Amino acid sequence: MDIDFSTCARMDVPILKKAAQGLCITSCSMQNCGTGSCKKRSGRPTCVCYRCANGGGDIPLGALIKRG
Fold it and tell me: Pro-segment residues?
């Protein structure tokens, strides 16, 4: 899957927020997490996770990497 700049509803097509957010809430479950919310950081579409198991909080797909 790798990382992706576009993973939030605040990217360009907010029409489908459920889809954009899915790349956070669902992406976390794949990393043995609980939930994940995305927010525009300094005008950049950043995806944040929460309720994780390997940290229980802010954990980016990069920190939850298991292939590196």
Answer: 65-68
d(CA 60, CA 68): 14
Residue type, 36: G
41, β-bridge pairs: 44
Which H or E run includes 25? helix 17-29
Of all helices (H) and strands (E), which one includes residue 20?
helix 17-29
Domain-by-domain residue ranges, the chain? Answer: 1-68
**Residue 9 and residue 21 in contact, taking contact as beta carbons nearer than 8 Å:** yes
Of 1, 2, 7, the residue nearest 38 (C-alpha): 7
Nearest by Cα to 33 from 10, 5, 60, 14: 60
Three-class SS state of 3:
coil
